[PDB]
Design a protein around this ligand. Sequence first.
Ligand SMILES: CC(C)n1nc(C(F)F)cc1C(=O)Nc1ccc([C@H]2[C@@H](O)CCCc3cncn32)c(-c2ccccc2)c1
Ligand SMILES: [Zn+2]
Lengths: 213, 292
Amino acid sequence: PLIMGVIRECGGKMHLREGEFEKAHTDFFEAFKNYDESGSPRRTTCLKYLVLANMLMKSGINPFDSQEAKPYKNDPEILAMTNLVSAYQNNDITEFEKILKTNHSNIMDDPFIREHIEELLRNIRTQVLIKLIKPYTRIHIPFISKELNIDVADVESLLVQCILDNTIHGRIDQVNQLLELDHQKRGGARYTALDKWTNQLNSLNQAVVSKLA
Amino acid sequence: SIDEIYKYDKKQQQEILAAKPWTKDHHYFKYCKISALALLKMVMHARSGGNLEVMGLMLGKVDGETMIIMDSFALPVENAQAAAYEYMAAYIENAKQVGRLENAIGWYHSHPGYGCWLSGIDVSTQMLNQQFQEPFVAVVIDPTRTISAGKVNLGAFRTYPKGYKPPDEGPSEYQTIPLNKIEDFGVHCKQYYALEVSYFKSSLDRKLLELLWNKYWVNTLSSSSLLTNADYTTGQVFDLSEKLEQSEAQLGRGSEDKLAKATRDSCKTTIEAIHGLMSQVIKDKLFNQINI
Ligand SMILES: CC(C)n1nc(C(F)F)cc1C(=O)Nc1ccc([C@H]2[C@@H](O)CCCc3cncn32)c(-c2ccccc2)c1
Ligand SMILES: [Zn+2]
């Protein structure tokens, strides 16, 4: 029982490079339950890939609460993955970075972890920034750089991407390097109604006057 | 003996119900009398409903050609049958042992922002209710126009039976119905007739209201109606602009004379706005211009 598991894992990787994370996650789970009755050394790698998929699509939400997940998660053979999941749930950039830095020769060596660690880091940074800008009205960009632990240029790039994607409702003041959040709104529907009324009145009086001769 | 209307005799009600005169004539009930408490209960329930529709029942009795409404209660409706009738029966059973002896006489529901009339569904519901349980009446309240016009907008209707064609005789006061409800108002307008509505109150209620006015004038003097209804005016202006567009389209070619109807709606909205402004002008003259 190894050929079908290997081909399932290969198909899972091919789907992972092609999006559609739901079916990729299902294929990863199928490969996991196939590897449960197969060679031990592949089980830790399959768990790593399953966790990678789970944190990649951030919607499955499958922690170690599963009855089959506990005997492998509690195994000290693989432990950095539990710390990474805990950091992802807690949304702590500092803990994520300290886990990444301390756990060398087990995370850097695997390339598939590296090809998505940037995406995971960007996801948690974006979530933290969105939570950060919640109460403020005008906020300095060096402040966000200090909080997220990145230089000012990367903070500006992240803000530009977020504003373009209609995620952050605000605008960047570049000359003095701040961010103004559009929290001040009023009842502008009355003026739109008045404008529509004015246009209709204009056309109507034109027609009424043109009726004569 | 103004309180004599509150005395309820079951024998007379049984005699009237067993000797039903409304089964022969069709334009029989032409007067509706509502207690002050019932009217206030309906108004508060409709206002608490918000911008949505709320419906309840109406307990009362009959007196000759008069439908008398004494109390009300609010159905849950989060439902036609099932839940609504369960609530009705349970509430009537609960209220029969505390002093409320009257049974249902009608149902009420709100029409927020589009007048007081019966739609097709309301006409079908009233036909169904009058088929089985009689007498009956449908009270429709506009909780939003009440604030805007400073007048209680309420209407008690009763539906003609299927297959009956009354010969004209419709006064039909003008109602500013929105554009999307004009067609529904046209097909079903001759299937029902309105009852003239009057209100009554007891002696203790009159004394209490007179004593209450000694301290309730403060709220009248500090109303500021120009801010409580600012989205209603915007919706009215939008509907009026659409009606103006339709009247202009009618003018370009060649209801009847839609320009007159659009003008009437514009006049109503503008007069409401000017009333709201002149109230604030009076307040400013009274309170702010005493500059010492
Ligand atoms: C007396 C009541 C309980 N009743 N008895 C029988 C009969 F089958 F016995 C039948 C009925 C009965 O529910 N009628 C009814 C019909 C339509 C609506 C709503 C419906 O269109 C959707 C909203 C738009 C609307 C504008 N005007 C009535 N509506 C309501 C209703 C009114 C207020 C709140 C909730 C519902 C009741
Ligand atoms: Zn209705």
